Design a binder for this molecule. Structure first.
Ligand SMILES: CCCCCCCCCCCCCCCCCC(=O)OC[C@H](COP(=O)([O-])OCC(O)COP(=O)([O-])OC[C@@H](COC(=O)CCCCCCCCCCCCCCCCC)OC(=O)CCCCCCCCCCCCCCCCC)OC(=O)CCCCCCCCCCCCCCCCC
Ligand SMILES: CCCCCCCCCCCCCCCCCC(=O)OC[C@H](COP(=O)(O)OCCN)OC(=O)CCCCCCCCCCCCCCCCC
Ligand SMILES: CCCCCCCCCCCCCCCCCC(=O)OC[C@H](COP(=O)(O)OCCN)OC(=O)CCCCCCCCCCCCCCCCC
Ligand SMILES: CCCCCCCCCCCCCCCCCC(=O)OC[C@H](COP(=O)(O)OCCN)OC(=O)CCCCCCCCCCCCCCCCC
Ligand SMILES: CCCCCCCCCCCCO[C@@H]1O[C@H](CO)[C@@H](O[C@H]2O[C@H](CO)[C@@H](O)[C@H](O)[C@H]2O)[C@H](O)[C@H]1O
Ligand SMILES: CCCCCCCCCCCCO[C@@H]1O[C@H](CO)[C@@H](O[C@H]2O[C@H](CO)[C@@H](O)[C@H](O)[C@H]2O)[C@H](O)[C@H]1O
Ligand SMILES: CCCCCCCCCCCCO[C@@H]1O[C@H](CO)[C@@H](O[C@H]2O[C@H](CO)[C@@H](O)[C@H](O)[C@H]2O)[C@H](O)[C@H]1O
Ligand SMILES: CCCCCCCCCCCCO[C@@H]1O[C@H](CO)[C@@H](O[C@H]2O[C@H](CO)[C@@H](O)[C@H](O)[C@H]2O)[C@H](O)[C@H]1O
Lengths: 155, 459, 172, 114, 106, 601
């Protein structure tokens, strides 16, 4: 495509805004550049940060999977907003409330797992008894040393 | 090495004196025979390297690179003959001559016993590569890509030349075998710090080290397929091979001079992998993938352990075959849709079912699926780097997660989903294209049956 | 929104009933509440103050958002349903048949004879279709995506090929 | 009813948006103008998509502008910042480990692979 | 609401073409034109057993018997459990029984 | 040993010949699915001969047949461990896989790529057997990642579907995060013990195993979909029902538990790891059973049941009962794979309908599906003397007669009650009541392939628990003395779950209209974990790519370098061409040469 149809520097004047919008197939009212600050966007339009999942599924798009039409300006982060990646569609619950309930559930569970560790359950039973000095030799004890015997009595 | 140098030169008369319609048949047929004879280099011994003469020698590090180099020439002719089909006959022969001269310099680079001989051949590869990119590239930006490639390399090589000539003056020799016995420790001083930087920064640029990597995506995006195959498969490995040889004479100073360059590689590999997730150009994605994979090789070479050199050796071979395959796969699409945009042509598995199997196999090797040599090499570096410092396992582990994400994302974007409605020129895969991918993937998978021959001299 | 007030109310009605049906599950229960909901719409059906009607709608939307099922029923092949796009991997475009090898085309001598007739019909009609659009599109370009019907006999409706020849919904 | 509160990752529903209502002659004239642009572009695409003799790609200038704008700005988490942070973590870790090895206080009884 | 007369007419026209197109997807009788009880089941499972079990097990056994087990520590068995009163086949040794049980019971 | 060793290898070799014939293309695609189904059925029989030998004389052996590679002092071989766990899992896996493939011959009959589907099912089973029989961690890693990739290719079977590609990649993402721990384990074992082979790891018996065991625990979390890395398993319901059946029973999801069972000689001496795994399992079993209470998609309900059951297995690991956890793997394999096949029978008959709200009245319309679904639900809930009783009942008694975290125990009992609640939910809405499906009735379940495949798994769901529990050798002291109220806990809470679930289910028939509680939404929306994390984490990462760096950049930029050379060039070359000015500069050069640099001195 001719050089005049490629992106350029940040627009400065109303005519540099008017020409940029026409280049991007946008209404001049709807055209808004990224704020000038050297980051490198240029005159590329700043389109709403909305996922492609949010677009009408029944409309006959030119690209049905991307839900894009041929010729419309692509969002700067379109590859981040394809239907396989970031989704921004509304949720039945508020975002802040989801975060509070989800974190609260996890924080509460960890608290009670700590209480469980401090006050474990167990049965009213003495320690298990093993013969031959707590199985000294079976557990790899060195035989040359003579271990202090462990003695178990009946009851 | 004359049993390989002379036959390689004979590829030039053969191409120039071949009948007009037979240049691609003859060059490919006889370059494959040279690749067949390259297997005789695998007469390796446990203790001594294979030292042919005063000029050339081969050990377990140069042999796999030599076999990879000579295997690649016939593959680049297959990849090249389509987009050159309308080229003037003489200019076809010159293009093939540039590839032959590149193999000639490369096999001598990897076998040179004298480091200054290595440097001249190491630096001679620039000329054919630069000519290929700027003459047979298809876009305006091929001229800037040529200059960046040229001046990034020379910026590091010229300091290297001074350091090598200094070393021969004070040691008396630059023969690699001699330097193994006459090496002396390098002590702390600002003079030795800059001798260390000169000896290494030329190789770091070719790897490339993160920070000095920006010439690589430029060159790849603008180079022809054959230029991308050699550049990714072999030319990046020149830096790794140079670092594996030069670090012999930089101890023990490498203990603390490595730190900044390990940090760049450990962090750089995470960032380059993440960048691959947002690349819009297919060739540029594969280029940034190499930077991520070659950062492992830099870390492995710098920590200097037996396991890290075996891992680095395997990585270089494995990445060479994988990256070359990925570029050829993206070229097969480009020859159809004539664009490098990854999102342009989607759902190709429907239209090109067998080419979708090659895409799957290439992606799996890129993410290093066990027991591929891509994993074996990557695993050995992780094992040794964990010993170097346990905390690195976090960065190593994260990189494997991100590497999986963009490898399969590139597979899903181009091969799955719905096909692009208006693109109606996706002709069935040619026998030439299918054979080209099988010649990458079959040898790569066969080496799993016998990986010792790609594990280098410390095996 | 492009939709008129009348269109907005109807879409809410259909949406409200469907989410009500998800809550009730049982058909007898759903029938009872569906009639109560229809009563609420019928109550203000004749409101003539478009500021009150607009208010009634906006409040209704807020109530729906509070009462919507978090997991409403979706028809399996509707967007979001469990079979949505399940068959897209079996839909092959018809232009792929041009690349078939002669030996492949020889197994269907009669299908590929009919196919040529359609291709001929497409070739012969195209020029007229382009002309019809040019002499019906107002200066400056179209204002809507609606396309015209054919007027003369022996004319096909403009831009018909990719609609008529599209893949079947169960292509394999 | 508790009002909807919109986040970056959870946008506001259209049905809950005051703008969508209160139709104004200017907003409709803006909506009618956008539809004209979309229909103009759709006709441009359709006259090539439906052309019997077109075999190839319908180059989209919108996609060319997108890739071109994305690939241009070649050159925190991108400077010395991350590097210095990680330098001290590994230097600190390897300094402690080296001291323990020298003091024989690090167990490497069976460590012979490195 | 409904279709406008032009909207209705266009759908009618595309409808005729679409249904004729779908009718043309049917295959003629000759198409495709290809180029040039227990006894049966028992045979079918006899061949599968022979090719997929007997031949593989012949190859495995030859491999394990004459190539794997001839190398040290290639196949390692957990040694057999010996119980009181057992007899060793190799050495003919008898293992003593256990001592008399205290003989609690219930 | 000759018959034992030889036959345990032909089992594995037999599964690969169908793969070799497809790849070598000397086969016959006339009936490839039947060929693959036949191969499993024979491999199951050949695997029973080694198993009987183990049952009889406790025979176990290791086969290290091929020396692959030596790395200085680390020698790697193709090494197969045919022990208690391998000899009991292989026949159970092959028996269930035999049923799934027979069911697949009916369910996927109209799929044009049926041959590829059965090729992928077989490769999916082959990697699971590599994983199960691996004697060293490298060969185990081959199987670990093998099942991961085969899950990816089968979850995303319908690759035109965008949600199937999202779900397939999400399985890779979570499982690959788990592999960070797996690589951590291999690194620690190589560094500290000099081995990846299990025999040497157990012989050296490291005392300081906190690091390697956390690595294996993190690996098990992703593979077994424990809390934190859990969402992918419900999302894996994108794949065809046969994939869900095989994925959730005798392949991928139990590899995480199976990995921790392999390393019980280490974990049994590490109380820190036991507490971590107990609490991880306890939260997983509660959280995913709570989610199942309000799911309306039949596959998702069964999927969340599997996560709940996998948590219970992880709890069993935590209370130091490795063999109970293994027995639950084997028993769960029968009835879970049957429930997924019973659900597939319903989905197929109701024209791809999966939502339970549009089912009902199937109790008599689908008699055989109904019988298997009740047996399956009773087996799952721990009905006395069905397959699931012989593991779940033992596990609960062990847990509540153990020195354990009290919160972990309570959450495991409540989750057990929830198991009855969501089992009633499937039975009540799918089978009881009046039909709620569309009018054109196509209910048909008379295919012999469907009947036989479910019939065999039905028989396993009844007696398999009894058969296995009576043949395995004892390896622990089973605690059989406890108060009546600890012995009968599992039965009681399960019964209360049935009663409580029945009342709520009947409560939906009333003409009442209710607003969702925050609790109802929280369960329905899976705790908001997928809603938050799957938007926030991808967004932070995908959008992830000071004055000091300004100097390090602006100074070293190629633009900076190239643009200073342009200034210097212009200064050098922008001259007036005047003899007067050039010779005036010759004068200055000479003066400063002498006065300033003393070049004449
Ligand atoms: C001595 C020197 C000998 C030279 C080497 C000899 C071997 C090469 C023989 C190739 C010629 C045979 C042939 O005609 O192939 C027909 C074969 C099937 O023919 P088809 O019916 O026309 O299928 C059409 C599609 O190509 C079929 O596509 P598909 O996707 O449906 O299936 C093909 C298959 C690709 O083929 C395979 O990879 C075989 C399955 C892997 C086992 O795809 C996959 O396997 C995807 C999953 C990848 C495996 C993941 C599991 C990892 C397991 C980890 C453990 C590994 C064990 C160690 O075609 C191919 O698949 C070509 C692939 C060639 C590479 C094979 C690599 C082996 C691995
Ligand atoms: C005990 C230990 C437990 C530890 C728990 C803490 C960690 C919890 C968070 C885990 C990571 C969460 C991100 C996973 C995102 C994902 O799963 O992908 C799914 C996402 C959308 O999928 P979905 O929500 O199902 O919607 C489809 C229906 N419309 O689709 C996507 O957007 C993904 C595709 C884009 C790729 C985004 C890259 C994400 C990378 C960040 C994740 C972490 C990367 C590894 C680093 C951490 C490992 C140490
Ligand atoms: C733009 C370049 C123009 C700016 C000036 C460049 C030079 C400034 C950097 C100084 C380099 C270090 C140096 O000069 O050391 C000299 C040192 C002299 O020591 P010598 O007398 O020979 O031995 C006895 C010691 N008493 O020499 C030695 O002892 C050993 C010297 C070995 C060779 C050093 C080569 C210098 C390397 C400088 C560049 C390194 C960074 C490369 C960056 C590449 C970027 C991609
Ligand atoms: C952790 C490991 C991970 C490995 C990943 C890679 C896996 C790749 C796929 C493996 C496939 C199975 C491999 C086993 C088959 C045998 C392979 C082989 O060539 O071994 C033969 C054997 C080799 O000798 P060996 O002592 O085992 O060690 C050699 C050192 N490399 O020497 C022999 O014993 C000779 C064999 C004679 C066979 C006679 C019977 C053949 C009958 C006709 C067959 C057709
Ligand atoms: C055996 C049971 C096992 C599972 C037990 C799980 C217990 C988990 C309890 C977590 C509680 C966290 O959730 C808590 O709920 C209330 C109810 O809205 C929230 O309250 C929130 O909602 C409304 C407004 O929206 C207001 O009440 C309040 O201003 C607001 O904060 C709290 O902000 C939140 O902290
Ligand atoms: C970091 C280690 C090695 C660094 C080596 C750096 C030395 C310089 C190497 C590149 C030299 C290229 O020299 C020249 O540079 C500029 C930009 O850089 C290019 O010019 C390009 O960029 C400039 C500004 O960025 C634009 O005004 C111009 O329109 C564009 O074509 C020239 O086409 C190229 O001829
Ligand atoms: C990519 C960038 C990489 C950056 C790497 C930075 C590494 C920094 C290395 C610092 C070590 C330099 O070398 C260090 O300095 C001087 C050499 O002049 C030596 O010391 C010598 O000079 C100093 C002068 O201050 C005297 O005090 C001292 O009497 C003398 O022996 C030190 O004993 C040596 O250890
Ligand atoms: C580390 C050492 C590396 C050594 C590398 C070798 C140095 C070679 C220096 C070549 C510099 C001359 O190259 C010249 O650079 C300027 C940079 O402004 C470019 O200038 C370009 O951008 C500038 C503004 O940025 C424009 O005014 C100009 O129109 C445009 O051409 C020229 O197009 C290029 O011709």
């Amino acid at each position: 495509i001719t050089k005049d149809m490629l992106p350029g520097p940040y627009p400065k004047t109303p005519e540099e805004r008017a020409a940029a919008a026409k280049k991007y197939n946008m209404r001049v009212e709807d055209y808004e550049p990224y704020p000038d600050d050297g980051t490198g966007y240029g005159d590329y339009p700043k389109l709403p940060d909305r996922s492609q999942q949010e677009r009408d599924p029944w409309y006959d798009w030119d690209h049905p999977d991307l839900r894009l039409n041929w010729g419309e300006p692509m969002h700067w982060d379109l590859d981040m907003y394809i239907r396989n990646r970031v989704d921004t569609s509304p949720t039945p619950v508020n975002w802040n409330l989801m975060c509070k309930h989800l974190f609260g559930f996890v924080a509460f569970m960890l608290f009670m797992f700590w209480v469980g560790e401090t006050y474990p359950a167990y049965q009213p039973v003495g320690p298990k008894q093993y013969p031959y000095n707590n199985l000294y030799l079976e557990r790899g004890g060195d035989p040359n040393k003579e271990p202090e015997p462990v003695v178990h009595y009946e009851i | 090495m004359l049993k390989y140098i002379i036959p390689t030169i004979m590829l030039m008369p053969l191409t120039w004196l071949s009948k007009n319609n037979m240049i691609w048949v003859n060059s490919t047929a006889h370059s494959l025979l040279i690749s067949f004879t390259s297997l005789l280099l695998m007469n390796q011994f446990g203790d001594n390297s294979l030292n042919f003469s005063l000029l050339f020698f081969s050990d377990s590090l140069s042999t796999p690179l030599l076999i990879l180099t000579m295997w690649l020439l016939p593959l680049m002719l297959m990849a090249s003959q389509h987009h050159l089909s309308k080229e003037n006959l003489t200019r076809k022969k010159l293009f093939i001559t540039m590839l032959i001269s590149l193999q000639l310099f490369l096999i001598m680079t990897f076998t040179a016993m004298e480091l200054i001989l290595f440097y001249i051949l190491f630096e001679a590869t620039l000329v054919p590569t630069l000519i290929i990119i700027t003459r047979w590239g298809n876009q305006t930006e091929r001229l800037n890509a040529g200059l960046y490639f040229l001046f990034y390399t020379l910026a590091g090589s010229l300091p290297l030349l001074v350091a090598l000539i200094y070393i021969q003056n004070t040691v008396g020799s630059l023969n690699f075998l001699m330097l193994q016995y006459w090496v002396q420790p390098v002590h702390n001083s600002w003079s030795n710090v800059f001798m260390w930087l000169a000896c290494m920064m030329a190789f770091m640029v070719k790897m490339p080290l993160y920070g000095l990597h920006l010439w690589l995506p430029k060159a790849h995006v603008e180079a022809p397929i054959a230029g991308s195959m050699v550049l990714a498969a072999v030319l990046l490995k020149l830096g790794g091979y140079g670092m594996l040889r030069i670090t012999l004479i930089l101890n023990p100073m490498t203990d603390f001079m490595a730190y900044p360059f390990i940090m760049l590689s450990l962090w750089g590999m995470i960032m380059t992998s993440s960048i691959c997730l947002r690349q819009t150009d297919l060739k540029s994605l594969i280029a940034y993938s190499s930077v991520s994979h070659m950062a492992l090789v830099i870390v492995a070479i710098l920590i200097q352990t037996p396991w890290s050199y075996m891992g680095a050796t395997a990585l270089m071979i494995a990445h060479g075959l994988t990256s070359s395959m990925l570029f050829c796969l993206a070229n097969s699409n480009y020859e159809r849709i004539h664009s490098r945009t990854m999102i342009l042509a989607r759902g190709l598995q429907t239209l090109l079912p067998l080419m979708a199997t090659w895409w799957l196999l290439a992606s799996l090797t890129n993410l290093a699926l066990p027991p591929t040599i891509n994993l074996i090499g990557e695993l050995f570096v992780v094992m040794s780097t964990f010993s170097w410092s346990n905390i690195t396992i976090i960065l190593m582990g994260v990189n494997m997660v991100i590497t999986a994400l963009y490898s399969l994302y590139m597979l899903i974007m181009t091969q799955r989903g719905k096909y692009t409605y208006h693109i109606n020129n996706i002709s069935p895969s040619f026998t030439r294209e299918n054979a080209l991918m099988s010649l990458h993937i079959l040898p790569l998978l066969l080496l799993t049956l016998n990986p010792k021959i790609i594990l280098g001299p410390l095996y | 929104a492009y939709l008129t007030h009348q269109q907005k109310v109807l879409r809410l009605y259909k949406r409200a009933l469907r989410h009500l049906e998800s809550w009730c599950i049982h058909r007898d229960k759903y029938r009872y509440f569906a009639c109560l909901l229809r009563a609420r719409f019928d109550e203000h059906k004749n409101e003539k103050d478009m500021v009150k009607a607009t208010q009634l709608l906006r409040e209704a939307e807020e109530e729906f958002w509070h009462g919507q099922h978090p997991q409403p029923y979706i028809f399996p092949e509707s967007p979001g349903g469990t079979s949505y796009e399940r068959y897209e991997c079996y839909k092959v475009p018809e232009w792929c048949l041009d690349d078939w090898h002669p030996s492949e085309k020889a197994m269907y001598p009669d299908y590929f004879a009919k196919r040529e007739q359609w291709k001929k019909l497409r070739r012969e009609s195209w020029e007229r279709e382009v002309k019809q659009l040019q002499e019906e599109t107002p200066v400056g370009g179209p204002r809507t995506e609606a396309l015209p019907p054919a007027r003369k006999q022996g004319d096909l409706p403009p831009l018909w090929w990719h609609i008529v020849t599209r893949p079947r919904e169960r292509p394999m | 009813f508790p009002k909807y509160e919109a986040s970056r990752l959870s946008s506001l529903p259209t049905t809950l948006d005051p703008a969508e209502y209160d139709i104004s002659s200017e907003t409709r004239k803006a909506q009618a103008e956008r539809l004209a642009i979309r229909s103009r572009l759709k006709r441009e695409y359709q006259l090539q998509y439906y052309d019997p003799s077109r075999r190839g790609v319908i180059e989209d200038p919108a996609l060319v502008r997108w890739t071109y704008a994305r690939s241009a700005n070649i050159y925190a988490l991108f400077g010395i910042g991350p590097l210095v942070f990680w330098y001290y973590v590994f230097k600190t870790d390897r300094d402690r480990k080296e001291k323990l090895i020298q003091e024989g206080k690090l167990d490497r009884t069976f460590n012979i692979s490195y | 609401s409904g279709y406008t007369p032009e909207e209705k007419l266009r759908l009618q026209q595309l409808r005729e073409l679409r249904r004729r197109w779908l009718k043309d997807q049917e295959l003629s009788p000759r198409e495709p034109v290809l180029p040039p009880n227990v006894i049966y089941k028992t045979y079918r499972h006899s061949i599968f057993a022979f090719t997929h079990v007997l031949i593989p097990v012949w190859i495995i056994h030859y491999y394990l018997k004459y190539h794997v087990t001839t190398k040290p520590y290639t196949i390692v068995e957990k040694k057999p459990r010996i119980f009181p009163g057992d007899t060793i086949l190799e050495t003919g040794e008898v293992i003593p029984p256990m001592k008399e049980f205290p003989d609690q019971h219930h | 040993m000759n018959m034992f060793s030889s036959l345990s290898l032909v089992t594995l070799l037999l599964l690969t010949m169908p793969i070799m014939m497809m790849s070598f293309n000397t086969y016959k695609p006339s009936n490839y699915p039947l060929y693959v189904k036949t191969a499993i059925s024979y491999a199951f029989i050949t695997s029973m001969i080694p198993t009987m030998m183990f049952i009889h004389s406790g025979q176990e052996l290791i086969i290290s047949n091929w020396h692959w590679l030596t790395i200085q002092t680390l020698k790697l071989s193709l090494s197969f461990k045919m022990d208690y766990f391998s000899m009991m899992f292989i026949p159970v896996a092959l028996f269930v896989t035999w049923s799934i493939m027979e069911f697949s011959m009916w369910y996927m009959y109209s799929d044009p790529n049926i041959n590829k589907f059965f090729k992928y099912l077989l490769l999916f089973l082959i990697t699971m057997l590599i994983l199960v029989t691996a004697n060293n961690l490298f060969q185990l890693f081959i199987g670990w990642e093998g099942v991961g990739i085969m899950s990816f290719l089968l979850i995303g079977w319908w690759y035109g579907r965008a949600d199937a590609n999202t779900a397939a990649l999400q399985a890779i993402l979570y499982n690959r995060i788990g592999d960070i721990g797996f690589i951590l384990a291999m690194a620690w074992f190589l560094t500290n013990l000099n081995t990846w082979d299990l025999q040497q790891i157990f012989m050296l018996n490291p005392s300081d195993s906190n690091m390697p065991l956390i690595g294996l625990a993190l690996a098990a979390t992703g593979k077994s979909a424990q809390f934190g890395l859990h969402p992918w398993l419900p999302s894996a319901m994108e794949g065809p029902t046969p994939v869900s059946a095989l994925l959730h029973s005798s392949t991928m999801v139990v590899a995480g538990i199976f990995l921790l069972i392999r390393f019980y000689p280490l974990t049994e001496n590490n109380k820190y790891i036991q507490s971590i795994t107990l609490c991880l399992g306890a939260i997983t079993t509660l959280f995913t059973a709570m989610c199942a209470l309000t799911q309306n998609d039949i596959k998702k309900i069964i999927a969340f049941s599997t996560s709940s059951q996998l948590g219970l297995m992880m709890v069993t690991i935590g209370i130091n009962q490795p063999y109970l956890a293994f027995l639950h793997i084997c028993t769960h394999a029968f009835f879970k794979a049957m429930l997924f096949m019973c659900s597939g029978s319903i989905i197929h008959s109701l024209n791809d309908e999966q939502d339970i709200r549009k089912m009902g009245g199937l109790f008599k319309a689908m008699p055989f599906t109904t019988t298997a679904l009740i047996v399956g639900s009773l087996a799952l809930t721990g009905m006395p003397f069905l397959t699931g009783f012989y593991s779940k009942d033992l596990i609960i008694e062990a847990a509540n007669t153990s020195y354990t975290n009290a919160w972990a125990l309570l959450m495991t009992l409540i989750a057990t009650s929830f198991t009855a609640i969501y089992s009633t939910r499937i039975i009540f809405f799918a089978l009881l009541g009046q039909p709620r499906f569309p009018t054109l009735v196509n209910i048909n379940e008379n295919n012999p392939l469907l009947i036989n495949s479910i019939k065999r798994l039905l028989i396993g769901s009844l007696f398999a628990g009894y058969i296995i529990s009576n043949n395995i050798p004892p390896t622990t002291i089973p605690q059989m003395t406890m108060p009546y109220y600890l012995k009968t806990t599992a039965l009681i809470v399960t019964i209360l779950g049935f009663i409580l679930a029945l009342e709520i289910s009947n409560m939906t028939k009333n003409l009442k209209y209710h607003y969702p509680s925050n609790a109802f939404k929280f369960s329905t929306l899976l705790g908001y974990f997928p809603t938050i994390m799957h938007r926030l984490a991808p967004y932070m990462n995908l959008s992830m790519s000071s004055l000091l760096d300004l100097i390090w950049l602006e100074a070293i930029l190629p633009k900076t370098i190239s643009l200073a050379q342009m200034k210097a060039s212009t200064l050098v070359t922008n001259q007036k061409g005047l003899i007067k000015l050039y010779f005036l500069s010759f004068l200055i050069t000479i003066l400063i040469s002498m006065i300033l640099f003393n070049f004449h001195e």
